[PDB]
Write a protein that binds this ligand. Structure first.
Ligand code: FAD
Length: 472
């Protein structure tokens, strides 16, 4: 570990990588150190629950290369390992570079001193610091009460190391249970379900809601989604609240509050995240008590020379106010912006971050703004053409990272032109405050503009025609 680095990026995920890239774009002599508690160099998370499981290629667990839905291979890593310089070389190497200290954790932050201390005792001073620590998976309290035998047979799915362990479990055991009905839980259900159809084994998905993604999607589409996951072979148990987990026979026994017993060999928990804010206390840094995460100003600053980006940040959304998100898009754009600000840009974060999820190559969702199933919603559906699927969208764009194909921009203008797919408008009064797109692609710029303008929209059916017609 060097003693000092001009740019110190704490955490080695998506936000950290985008900030490193941005810093080096604006200052090509810059010396950037990423400190990553994981053994792996920076990598994107979306394939871990999607294309890596759909690959029929051997070796996938070793190589972490995946085929997109269009059949083109891509690495999980943001860049080849050859592109980084060594941490030892970074302070003096000609033209600077980006180094990663892997397997190291920042445990203390000294803001007054512009210094951090690592788990190994090392001290690093900085000029400009980014906190991009992401978040930690939530447990289920019934699992924490359970024996050591239960805990060792529970995966909190989040990293490469979890893909590798679970993929092997999937080939060894007869039954895996996913707890959580959210996008990630549902992705993993389809993933494991596909492998289990091959092996003749069992996959269960359980959650308290009436259908998959029940907190976000309206009842019709949530149920549709549950049927789709069931068509994959998965036993989906909605209305399921876990009372306890123990052991009975040679199995884990999950007892639901309603009396149902579920027997299984392994549990995967996908019940959300908590931002990694441990450094706030030594730092004296403000955390948002309502939403979680480090509070940041318009420019993503927590202090004059500390920025925060990605899952860890609680920022003021241009239209929603204070919020935190768990969006790949946000981690990329806020990371990039934080890097620009670290190099003097003084730019505010005005981005409206999008989210996507794929349940295999034939089903895709996108979301933007305030998407909460308890709001009044208006769904406008149409029938799918051959191109209304994540596969075609990947084929047209060359990428399956939907935030790249959609673009980050908002449309210039909205003027109106005089089920398998659709748009769901989420309303506050009769203002569209959020939108979900189901099998509709390359219209995020439009959805951003509709939410941004915040006009009253009486006839949402005319507005829907922007989504339901060809792109095109
Ligand atoms: C399996 C999975 C699938 C997903 N799929 C999608 C998707 O399809 N679409 C979508 O929009 N989003 C998706 N997401 C969400 C998206 O990946 C996250 O929003 C994104 O990773 C956030 O990036 P980040 O840099 O803020 O945090 P991360 O990428 O989580 O990186 C944070 C890093 O910092 C490290 N760290 C934490 N504390 C310290 C410390 N004190 N010292 C050193 N290192 C530290 C952590 O180990 C971690 O590596 C998915 C997430 C997961 C887990």
């Amino acid at each position: 570990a060097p003693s000092h680095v001009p740019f110190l990026l704490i955490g080695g995920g998506t936000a950290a990588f985008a900030a490193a890239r941005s810093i080096r774009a604006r200052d090509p002599g810059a010396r950037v150190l990423i400190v990553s508690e994981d053994p792996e160099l920076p990598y994107m998370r979306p394939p871990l629950s999607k294309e890596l499981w759909f690959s029929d290629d051997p070796n996938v667990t070793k190589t972490l290369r995946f085929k997109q839905w269009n059949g083109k291979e891509r690495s999980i890593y943001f860049q080849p390992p050859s592109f980084y310089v060594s941490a030892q070389d970074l302070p003096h190497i000609e033209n600077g570079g980006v180094a990663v200290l892997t397997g190291k954790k920042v445990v203390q932050l000294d803001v007054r001193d512009n210094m951090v201390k690592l788990n190994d005792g090392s001290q690093i001073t900085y000029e400009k610091c980014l906190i991009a620590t992401g978040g930690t998976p939530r447990s289920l309290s019934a699992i924490d009460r359970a024996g050591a035998e239960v805990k060792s047979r529970t995966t909190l799915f989040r990293k490469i190391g979890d893909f590798r362990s679970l993929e092997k479990i999937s080939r060894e055991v007869k039954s895996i249970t996913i707890i959580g009905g959210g996008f990630l839980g549902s992705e993993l259900a389809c993933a494991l379900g596909r492998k289990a159809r091959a092996l003749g084994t069992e996959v269960i998905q359980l959650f308290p809601e009436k259908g998959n993604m029940g907190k976000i999607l309206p009842e019709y589409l949530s149920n549709w989604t549950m049927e789709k996951v069931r068509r994959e072979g998965v036993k989906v148990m909605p209305n399921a609240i876990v009372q306890s987990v123990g052991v009975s026979s040679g199995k884990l026994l999950i007892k639901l509050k309603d009396g149902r017993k579920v027997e299984t060999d392994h549990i995967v928990a996908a019940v959300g995240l908590e931002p990694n804010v441990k450094l706030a206390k030594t730092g004296g840094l403000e955390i948002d008590s309502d939403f979680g995460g480090f509070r940041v100003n318009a420019e993503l600053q927590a202090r004059s020379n500390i920025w925060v980006a990605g899952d860890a940040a609680c920022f003021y959304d241009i239209k929603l106010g204070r919020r935190r998100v768990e969006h790949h898009d946000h981690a990329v754009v806020s990371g990039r912006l934080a890097g620009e600000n670290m190099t003097g840009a003084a730019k505010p974060y005005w981005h409206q971050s999008m989210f996507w999820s794929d349940l295999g190559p034939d089903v895709g969702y996108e979301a933007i703004g305030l998407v909460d199933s308890s709001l009044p919603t208006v769904g406008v559906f149409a029938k799918a053409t051959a191109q209304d699927n994540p596969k075609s969208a990947t084929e047209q764009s060359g990428t399956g990272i939907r935030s790249e194909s959609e673009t980050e921009s908002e449309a210039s203008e909205i003027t109106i032109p005089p089920y398998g797919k659709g748009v769901i408008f989420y309303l506050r009064d009769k203002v569209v405050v959020g939108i979900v797109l189901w099998n509709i692609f390359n219209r995020m710029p439009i959805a951003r503009k509709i939410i941004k303008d915040g006009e009253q929209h009486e006839d949402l059916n005319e507005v829907a025609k922007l989504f339901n017609i060809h792109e095109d």
